[PDB]
């Protein structure tokens, strides 16, 4: 029922890059999803205490959220675009795992994921 430490956003010994694809992931992908009307549940780690979801972190063992992704991008945490794309997909998958089809939160994730897919379809070479 308690919250775990959040995913790390800083690790000085992890090697880092600022590739054109990573810049696109921040300036296009993250920015588009972050401003969406349905972004709010995904803008920070799930607070299982405040939301009264005592089983959330029993089921979700690789938590991820756009607040974490935003900090990772702004902090140049990643080596490549695939790492960041994986974080987005982990976020969506966690939502679908924990919740039920048709739940409001699932419809919200689906809308954000549709935009995600549209933007990553134009990921620059």
From Swiss-Prot:
Known tissue expression: Ubiquitously expressed.
Cross-link (Glycyl lysine isopeptide (Lys-Gly) (interchain with G-Cter in SUMO2)): 58
Site (Acetylated histone binding): 99
The Bromo domain, residue ranges: 17-123
Compartment(s) where it occurs, according to its Swiss-Prot or TrEMBL record: Nucleus; Chromosome
PTM entry text: Phosphorylation by CK2 disrupt the intramolecular binding between the bromo domain 2 and the NPS region and promotes binding between the NPS and the BID regions, leading to activate the protein and promote binding to acetylated histones. In absence of phosphorylation, BRD4 does not localize to p53/TP53 target gene promoters, phosphorylation promoting recruitment to p53/TP53 target promoters.
Subunit structure: Interacts with p53/TP53; the interaction is direct. Interacts (via CTD region) with CDK9 and CCNT1, acting as an associated component of P-TEFb complex. Interacts with RELA (when acetylated at 'Lys-310'). Interacts (via NET domain) with NSD3, CHD4, BICRA and ATAD5. The interaction with BICRA bridges BRD4 to the GBAF complex. Interacts (via NET domain) with JMJD6 (via JmjC and N-terminal domains); the interaction is stronger in presence of ssRNA and recruits JMJD6 on distal enhancers. Interacts with NSD3. Interacts with NIPBL.
Family label: Belongs to the BET family.
Anything else known: JQ1, a thieno-triazolo-1,4-diazepine derivative, and I-BET, a benzodiazepine derivative, have been tested on tumors with success. Treatment with GSK1210151A (I-BET151, a I-BET derivative) has strong effets on mixed lineage leukemia and promotes myeloid differentiation and leukemia stem-cell depletion.
Disorder cited: Cornelia de Lange syndrome 6: A form of Cornelia de Lange syndrome, a clinically heterogeneous developmental disorder associated with malformations affecting multiple systems. It is characterized by facial dysmorphisms, abnormal hands and feet, growth delay, cognitive retardation, hirsutism, gastroesophageal dysfunction and cardiac, ophthalmologic and genitourinary anomalies. CDLS6 inheritance is autosomal dominant.
Domain comment, as recorded: The NET domain mediates interaction with a number of chromatin proteins involved in transcription regulation (NSD3, JMJD6, CHD4, GLTSCR1 and ATAD5). The C-terminal (CTD) region mediates interaction and recruitment of CDK9 and CCNT1 subunits of the P-TEFb complex. It is also required for maintenance of higher-order chromatin structure.
Role summary: Chromatin reader protein that recognizes and binds acetylated histones and plays a key role in transmission of epigenetic memory across cell divisions and transcription regulation. Remains associated with acetylated chromatin throughout the entire cell cycle and provides epigenetic memory for postmitotic G1 gene transcription by preserving acetylated chromatin status and maintaining high-order chromatin structure. During interphase, plays a key role in regulating the transcription of signal-inducible genes by associating with the P-TEFb complex and recruiting it to promoters.
The protein's name: Bromodomain-containing protein 4
Source organism per UniProt: Homo sapiens
Parent-protein start and end of this portion: 44 to 166 of 1362
């Amino acid at each position: 029922s308690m919250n775990p430490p959040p995913p790390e956003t800083s690790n000085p010994n992890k090697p880092k890059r600022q590739t054109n694809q990573l810049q696109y992931l921040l300036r296009v992908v993250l920015k588009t999803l972050w401003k969406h009307q349905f972004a709010w549940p995904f803008q920070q780690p799930v607070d299982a205490v405040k939301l009264n979801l005592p089983d959330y972190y029993k089921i979700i063992k690789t938590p991820m959220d756009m607040g974490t992704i935003k900090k990772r991008l702004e902090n140049n945490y990643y080596w490549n675009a695939q790492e960041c794309i994986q974080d987005f997909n982990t976020m969506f998958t966690n939502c679908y795992i924990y919740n039920k089809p048709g739940d409001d939160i699932v419809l919200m994730a689906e809308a954000l994921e549709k935009l995600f897919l549209q933007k990553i379809n134009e990921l620059p070479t």
